[PDB]
Amino acid sequence: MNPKSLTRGPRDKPTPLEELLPHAIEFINQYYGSFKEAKIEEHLARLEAVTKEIETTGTYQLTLDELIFATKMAWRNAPRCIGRIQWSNLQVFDARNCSTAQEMFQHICRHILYATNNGNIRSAITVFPQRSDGKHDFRLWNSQLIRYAGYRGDAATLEFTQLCIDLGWKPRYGRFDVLPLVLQADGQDPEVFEIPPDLVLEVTMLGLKWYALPAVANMLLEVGGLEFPACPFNGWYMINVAVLHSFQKQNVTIMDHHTASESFMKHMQNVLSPFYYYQIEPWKTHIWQN
């Protein structure tokens, strides 16, 4: 067998132009190929402009339409995602001009707001600035945007919870404490941000509940040789029947037969690359500056 690694790690230098160029060209082909017989002269003009940009600046910028296409094809290329059958239903938020952690925070609040939509969940992705030299990465240290702390609590976040504590987050001691956002901008040490409680929608099932929005915070989007290490996205959720009942009763989207049908109906009315990679946990690789 010759499987590929599903993980894409850090760099300390910009991608060499001899590597970047061929990948960019191949992506540009995939993009314009989605027009088949149309736009041959536009295709050629874009190839020429991308090359000059790479040769003069060392890298290049995608157009908004190219980025939207990229996020949807990478979703389509996601092997285990059951949601990818309706890949055209995706809202993109372009945050490639973001510069600070405070700004990252505001972008994520907007994402959570739009995607939760009072319970009528919508799929979205927010794209932060692409990697440059690898020393100025944007990263979300959380694995999901919304997740409970573990001390009592979620057993699988003991490590990250302790980390938030080490960073000056005050630990409550319930079993449903929503962890803070831990946000790295421009390669700096991360900063801790409480999520405004009113942004977190929960479904009550004894005192049992769970958050409504499943959003992956920690993967990397690759496209045409460019890498975006910060690109949170969300879908909706897929002895056990209590939950299926509680979400429907409370009008929160899950992937039941009705939803599978309607979301597919909406879709129809509309080495793999591009691709979403896993990353190495940033607290294992980060060099602290203070």
Ligand X SMILES: Cc1cc(Oc2ccc3c(c2)OCO3)nc(Oc2ccc(-n3ccnc3)cc2)n1
Q: Is 144 annotated as a binding residue?
A: yes
Q: Identify what 69 binds: ligand X, ligand HEM, its own copies, none; CB under 5 to 8 Å per kind.
A: none
Backbone φ and ψ for 62, nearest 5 degrees, come out as: -75, 150
168 forms part of the interface with ligand HEM (CB under 6 A)? no
- From the list 58-66, 88-96, 188-196, 234-242, the region that binds ligand X by CB under 6 A is 234-242
Task: Determine the Cα–Cα distance for residues 64 and 285; give it in Å rounded to an integer.
Answer: 31
Contact call for residue 81 and ligand HEM (CB under 6 A): yes
- Does 203 contact ligand X by CB under 6 A? no
- Give the Cα separation of 16 and 58 in Å (integer): 8
What is the binding site for its own copies (CB under 8 A)? 1-7, 9-12, 64, 91, 102, 105-106, 109-110, 113-114, 117-118, 158-159, 191-194, 196, 199, 278, 280, 284-285
Contact 192, 168 (CB under 8 A): yes
Pairing of strands 124-127, 91-94: parallel
One-letter amino acid identity for 31?
Answer: Y
Q: In sequence order, what E strands does the chain have?
A: 91-94, 124-127, 139-140, 181-184, 191-193, 202-204, 209-211, 215-216, 220-223, 226-228, 233-234, 275-277
User: Could you say which residues in the range 138-197 bind ligand X, by CB under 6 A?
Assistant: 144
Instruction: Say whether residue 81 binds ligand X (CB under 6 A).
Output: yes
Among 1, 16, 18, 79, the residue binding ligand HEM under the rule CB under 6 A is 79
CA distance linking residue 31 with residue 64, whole number of Å: 12
Residues that bind ligand HEM (CB under 6 A): 71, 75, 78-83, 90, 123, 125, 233, 235-236, 238, 255, 276
Residues that bind ligand X (CB under 6 A): 81, 83, 144, 214, 216, 234-235, 237-238
